Enzyme design. Structure first.
Site, PDB file in Angstrom:
ATOM      1  CD  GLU C  72      -5.598  40.160   4.807  1.00  0.00           C
ATOM      2  OE1 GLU C  72      -5.453  39.350   3.869  1.00  0.00           O
ATOM      3  OE2 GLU C  72      -5.444  39.848   6.007  1.00  0.00           O
ATOM      4  CB  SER C 141      -4.390  29.669   5.874  1.00  0.00           C
ATOM      5  OG  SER C 141      -4.502  31.016   6.299  1.00  0.00           O
ATOM      6  N   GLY C 145      -5.215  34.629  10.565  1.00  0.00           N
ATOM      7  CA  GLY C 145      -6.413  34.785  11.371  1.00  0.00           C
ATOM      8  C   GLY C 145      -7.672  35.018  10.564  1.00  0.00           C
ATOM      9  CD  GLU C 255     -20.559   4.297   0.763  1.00  0.00           C
ATOM     10  OE1 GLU C 255     -20.570   3.995   1.975  1.00  0.00           O
ATOM     11  OE2 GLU C 255     -21.310   3.763  -0.080  1.00  0.00           O
TER      12      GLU C 255
END
EC number: 3.6.5.-
Lengths: 440, 427, 440
Positions: C72, C141, C145, C255
């Site tokens: 986009e 996110s 999608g 760690e």
């Protein structure tokens, strides 16, 4: 075993709390906003106390540790729009938004206990915030249903959570002459059973006696509720006299229940404060402690519409502030015993707890009480309020003949069995009141 | 991948497209003499969707308007803003389609449409980021239903990867301008369902009802209705041409709103539905727009929403809006309106956010959803056929050109299949 | 083993990245355009780090090493028309021009992998630019999608190219109450398998919990996505606390997987940040680390809509910034163990990783978080999100009964076998969640 948490329920309790924190700021030198302005002493925190009622912020601020719970948002808004906003934590001000009664119709039922969870969580977090816990202070009005219901619910909740801390309840009782609303006796007695089963030390205060002394001793033609709040604020803050200031013989909170209450039985001592004089009568009176004790023994200064001299003797505590002499007070109490006062019991047989405090007595500038060099706060579990509960119970019988309210009371889920159980509990309490003095 | 070519056909389609053009030129800002008025940047790259840069800094539309009557363009070039239209955009002939389906595209409508297809191709290589195809026509109209479906057929033939958007106006089952209006409507939907990916249900009587309810309009004018439908049409693409939290595209409508390509009928709702004289007395907020969205008298299907149930609903919000208001109101509606939502999504919701405010308003939105109330309109039309057309009166006008009863029986089977799909998916 | 490369996918991930580089410029003293203005420290680069996230230009400029991949172009244009243009290299801003879905319909398929070659070439060139490579940061996110698909594709690609670097993924999970779009659960779970097979450490963040704390702790009536981005920006930048500033006991990235993850099994720790207060509540709170840890244990501050106290104990890390005392934190954690918290396992059996950082905690001026002298970031791989995946999986079963989407999903080339395999993988993950605590 270091901190005391105070909770005020109801509009009257909130006003009393506002007055008492105003005083606390006054004597301990905190400005009406805090931080500081400035610190005074040495001893006011440090060294401890404080902290005893005011949280010691790391930045140097002083924050009262109190929770304002109420379903009427007007009181919370009045607290938040004044100088009290800088003293109370925003999360400690539990503002309610539901108004359906005032308030015992739904307060002591399922309507209140979905909010009690948040209150218990908040007070647990506050207890974890501080180091140790000593006791709780309660300020609610038995007239307003909010105070009765919510305070009683908190009573059983916090008696269940710890069960080992001292429980001090300053409950405002309805006037025995007339009642401002008809449901106040229910709000009082339907929680008297919970108070009996879940309290350690309860203090009885009557608005009628305060108004009487304001009209007579203060020469005030129109006493105000603020004056009553200030007077009982000094009464509370002188208890609570050696816990924040140095004294030759400090008095401990546990000592009250060790000496005044030697049984799993009656633990409801009276209170009295004296001298009570105006700013214009301070140019003629310089009396000793004997006349102050005599004024304490007066029915008008006992905050109960009864005769304390007609009862039978019970263990009592005498707290002294300012310049006092032990020989003088021993002479005074011996004279009082010589005057053949209330019949001494054979179990103590004569116990006069004497408390000496170095700090001078303090008075509120908003009140017309003149500053005095010596004051007496007297605590006694005298059986003279027995006729007061008897009068309340006669009112109960006459308005229970028709029952007058059982329609709504049953409709929400209760029944007459609870009222009968409260009636017989009050009768048993009065019988115990008679018997504890009748045994001797 | 943003440019949109707006195809216009039919008597009502020309007016709708023109009104959409004035609404577009007013919402982004462009005077008819070729003066730049965008403010400042976002209104400049987004006008390439509808306009192309001509010489001397001129912007001209890329839109093919076709109609067999040439009187509408005279009321376009000399009337309000249509002067930007290049003369080659005028593809018109003589003289009419006969207001029927047999002569609309079967025999005579297939002559100039080859030139139409050629000019569509030349605009296709003239375009760089062709995204979708907008068509406005009349379901019962002779011209719109006539060559509209055949244009859909070619646009599917030449573009197998491009979806199609249709906004045909559905005639009401109670108003009969001509005896064969539902006949043409059904002969058009016979191929519309087999050649379209999504469509909107538009009824003029619903527009009249909303005008007499909220607008209190005294003069019945098609111009105001065109303005409303053009505002809705602009609103469904403001999300694409103005970024927000979630930009929405027509393919996103196909993916989310459409359950499957066979079922693509949608009812349209718009908000706020306010008129002059109430602007100084209301607070225009998200919750109020929401109660105006689910109000049973605000959609233009027009059917009864609370007697059936929804299958999936969508919200296309516009303007400066916080994320919390819309989601909180959506929780509220999902809590109070849980009964009418399907029990298998189970959260029927699709949200889109637009940045710029609507023209002439502060906050606005569009409503797109799927319910089981369209099968009622379908069975009403089918019953109208089963009543009127069993007499075979005035039916020879179509069979004269070679129409068979097999096509009508197949259309009846198609509407039965649509009803069954609307019952899967039970009401 | 020196540099960390961060990649943001999706509009939400791009906003989070924008916020986090705004912060990074804030504490390390880089102006919103860079060069310089001016350099601060000593230690900020030199000495190293930086360079750790900002490339050290020979001219003296600081350039973030991030790749913005998205189909986009609006997000890339918004980045390029603001002050971010001077921070990101023009070739690192991969602007897409194809829009057919948003985006998992075609993102996780052949449509995306003809562009992935250029992305892999660019990241390989960037890795060759710097000396060494330590780990990767992911911000995408799972609702959008684009994030799910493209991020997962990059996950398998960069797990194949190296297979030896730490993989940190900050994935935004859809709200479990309601979903903004219906296909978000598919975008999450159809890539959960790739995450399980190709991730080393994944962090779960929920927008609903951030909004809840903004409404409650921040007292914000209308929280914004920018506030969420800033909050999780501090959360990310405090991890990532001792890697850029000096500390008594620095914590290494390896760690985390040495202590928290002792198996080829579950490696998905929770995160929490505290204290969380506004600029108006900073005049009443000066609490110690014990109450901050208690706030971390609160479900509302865990960024998950579940109860972390109802789960079973797992190895956890505690990171401290500002003025802290080791004796105080040892006392606090011992008290927490005394309160009988989540059931301790017998395999560690009790491991509390303590991290101390000298730099004071920092807050964003765009956010309403008050600057505090001490803050806690807590990381724990608690099994309390198991019911969260269970709720998501119940949603999956109910919307998979009709399958609702298999038309397009099969039409592009997939089939129900992949969905069934993801279903059984999620069931196996939940069973392992139960078993890892059930063994003890």
């Amino acid at each position: 075993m270091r901190e005391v948490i105070s909770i005020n329920v109801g509009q009257a309790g909130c006003q009393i709390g506002n007055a008492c924190w105003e005083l606390y700021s006054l004597e301990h030198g905190i400005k009406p906003d805090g931080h500081l302005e400035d610190g005074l002493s040495k001893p006011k925190g440090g060294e401890e106390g404080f902290s005893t009622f005011f949280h010691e912020t790391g930045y140097g601020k002083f924050v009262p540790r109190a929770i304002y719970v109420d379903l009427e948002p007007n009181v919370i808004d009045e607290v938040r729009n004044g100088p009290y906003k800088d003293l109370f934590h925003p999360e400690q001000l539990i503002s309610g938004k539901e108004d359906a009664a005032n308030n015992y119709a739904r307060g002591h039922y399922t309507v209140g206990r979905e909010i009690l969870g948040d209150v218990l969580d908040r007070i647990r977090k506050l207890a974890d915030q501080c180091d140790g816990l000593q006791g709780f202070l309660f300020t609610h009005s038995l007239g307003g249903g909010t105070g009765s219901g919510l305070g009683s619910l908190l009573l059983e909740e916090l008696s269940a959570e710890y069960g080992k801390k001292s429980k001090l309840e300053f409950a405002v009782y309805p006037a025995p002459q007339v009642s401002t609303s008809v449901v106040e006796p229910y709000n009082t007695v339907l929680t008297t059973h919970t108070t009996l089963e879940h309290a350690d030390c309860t203090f009885m205060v009557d608005n009628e006696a305060i108004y009487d002394m304001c009209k007579r001793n203060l020469d005030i033609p129109r006493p105000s509720f603020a004056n009553l709040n200030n007077l009982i604020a000094q009464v509370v803050s002188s208890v609570t006299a050696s816990l924040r200031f140095d004294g030759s013989l400090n008095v401990d909170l546990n000592e009250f229940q060790t000496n005044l209450v030697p049984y799993p039985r009656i633990h409801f001592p009276l209170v009295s404060y004296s001298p009570v004089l105006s700013k214009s009568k301070a140019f003629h009176e310089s009396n000793s402690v004997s006349e102050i004790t005599n004024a304490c023994f007066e029915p008008g200064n006992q905050m109960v519409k009864c005769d304390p001299r007609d009862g039978k003797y019970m263990a009592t505590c005498l707290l002294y502030r300012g310049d006092v002499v032990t020989r003088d007070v021993q002479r005074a109490v011996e004279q009082v015993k010589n005057k053949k006062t209330v019949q001494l019991v054979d179990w103590c047989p004569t116990g006069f707890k004497i408390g000496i405090c170095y700090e001078p007595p303090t008075a509120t500038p908003n009140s017309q009480l003149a500053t005095v060099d010596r004051a007496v706060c007297m605590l006694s579990n005298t059986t003279s309020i027995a006729e007061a509960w008897k009068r309340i119970d006669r009112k109960f019988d006459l308005m229970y003949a028709k029952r007058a309210f059982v329609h709504w009371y049953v409709g929400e889920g209760m029944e007459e069995g609870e009222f009968t159980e409260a009636r017989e509990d009050l009768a048993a309490l009065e019988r115990d009141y008679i018997e504890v003095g009748a045994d001797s | 991948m943003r440019e949109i070519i707006h195809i216009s056909t039919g008597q009502c389609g020309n007016q709708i497209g023109a009104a959409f053009w004035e609404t577009i030129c007013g919402e982004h800002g462009l005077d008819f003499n070729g003066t730049y008025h965008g403010h400042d940047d976002i209104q400049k790259e987004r006008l390439n969707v509808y306009f192309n840069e001509a010489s001397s800094g001129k912007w001209v539309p890329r839109s093919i308007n076709v109609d067999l009557e040439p009187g509408t363009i005279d009321a376009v070039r000399n009337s309000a803003i249509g002067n930007l239209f290049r003369p080659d955009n005028y593809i018109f002939g003589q003289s009419s389609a006969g207001n029927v389906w047999a002569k609309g595209h079967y025999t005579e409508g297939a002559e100039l449409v080859d030139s139409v297809m050629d000019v569509i191709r030349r605009e296709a290589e003239g375009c760089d980021s062709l995204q979708g195809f907008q068509i406005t026509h009349s379901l019962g109209g002779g011209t719109g239903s006539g060559m509209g479906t055949l244009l859909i057929s070619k646009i599917r033939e030449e573009f197998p990867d491009r979806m199609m958007a249709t906004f045909s106006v559905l005639p009401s089952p109670k108003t009969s301008d001509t005896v064969v209006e539902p006949y043409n409507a059904t002969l058009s939907v016979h191929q519309l369902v087999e050649h379209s990916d999504e469509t909107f249900c538009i009824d003029n009587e619903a527009l009249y009802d909303i005008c007499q309810r909220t607008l209190k309009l005294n003069q019945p004018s098609y111009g105001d209705l065109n303005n409303l439908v053009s505002s809705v049409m602009s609103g469904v693409t403001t999300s694409l041409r103005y970024p927000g939290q979630l930009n929405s595209d027509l393919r996103k409508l196909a993916v989310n709103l459409v359950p499957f390509p066979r079922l693509h009928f949608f009812m349209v709702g718009y908000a706020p539905l306010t008129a002059i004289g109430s602007q100084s007395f209301r607070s225009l907020t998200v919750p109020e727009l929401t109660q105006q969205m689910f109000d049973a008298k605000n959609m233009m299907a027009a059917a009864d929403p609370r007697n059936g149930r929804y299958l999936t609903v969508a919200a296309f919000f516009r303007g400066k809006v916080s994320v919390k208001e819309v989601e909180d109101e959506m929780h509220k509606v999902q809590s109070k309106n849980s009964d009418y939502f399907v029990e298998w999504i189970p959260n029927n919701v699709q949200t889109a956010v637009c940045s710029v405010a609507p023209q002439g308003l502060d906050m606005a939105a569009t409503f797109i959803a799927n319910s089981t109330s369209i099968q009622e309109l379908f069975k009403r039309v089918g019953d109208q056929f089963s009543a009127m057309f069993k007499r075979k009166a005035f039916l020879h006008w179509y069979t004269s050109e070679g129409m068979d009863e097999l096509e009508f029986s197949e259309a009846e089977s198609n509407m039965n299949d649509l009803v069954s799909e609307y019952q899967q998916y039970q009401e």
